[PDB]
């Protein structure tokens, strides 16, 4: 089997991407944030504290003839950006882009943090990291991909995120029309439960390539590119007037600037992030200070190849017995 679904930015800055997912019988379609940095599929629901729902579409398990309470199971998750959610668990039928899993754990939120409430466009998350990170207790549950894997034509999914435009998540096949040149595959460590890999270096604009190992995770659920302070300082030093602002929470730059590109290495291959991808717009409405899309990972504890990086590439998440990651230009 295979599946193919379009993923759409939630706003004009590509702050996140939503993908429609069918849950239950008859189908209830919710727009979920596909997140390769976590492993829970959770949804706003009829059980979510009413004051914490503000415009989201909810899953109502009592209206699904295939929903079953997973008796005794609870979940609770906290994300790197400080947001959180928790609740109980149902199993139900879940379909993405024509690919159907029966008996999928659908985690129903009883509580969500304010960041989730305030984002009316995101109805929940669909985790695509390794199932060892799943938070369901006392019986850990499998991700959608893990459940689908044996049925797929090939045990893979791909992320093809757009810049200020829709893109695609495919399951079970590689669309050879979706990228240019060849796909360069690179090793993955699953020891922390993430799609963790090692970039071979970077360049700023038309500058020379610096060969250096940068360990980090491929994370579709993180907006920006978080890299070591040395790398980030080297990038912003090429933008006149750019500076790190404690008050704002990172690097900002004059909105009058033209941003240089940023290149990252994948083995001997190179992925170029155009400068415009690094512009996240005025820090507040009307400001001439703009927020940067490359930020320091210092004090996150990990480097994160988030959407800023991933949207410059066609990315293969290969879930074979020994997982790997593939990157192609597009």
Curated annotation (Swiss-Prot):
Record key words, sorted: Aspartyl protease, Disulfide bond, Hydrolase, Protease, Signal, Zymogen
Disulfide links within the chain: 255-290
Catalytic EC class: hydrolase
List of catalytic residues: 35, 199
Statement: the UniProt record of this protein carries the keyword Signal: yes
GO BP annotation list: proteolysis
EC number of the protein: 3.4.23.22
Sequence ranges assigned to domain Peptidase A1 in this UniProt record: 17-328
Catalytic activity: Hydrolysis of proteins with specificity similar to that of pepsin A, prefers hydrophobic residues at P1 and P1', but does not cleave 14-Ala-|-Leu-15 in the B chain of insulin or Z-Glu-Tyr. Clots milk
GO MF annotations, alphabetized: aspartic-type endopeptidase activity
Coiled coil (UniProt feature): none
Similarity comment text for this entry: Belongs to the peptidase A1 family.
Protein name in UniProt: Endothiapepsin
Organism annotation: Cryphonectria parasitica (Chestnut blight fungus)
Name of encoding gene: EAPA
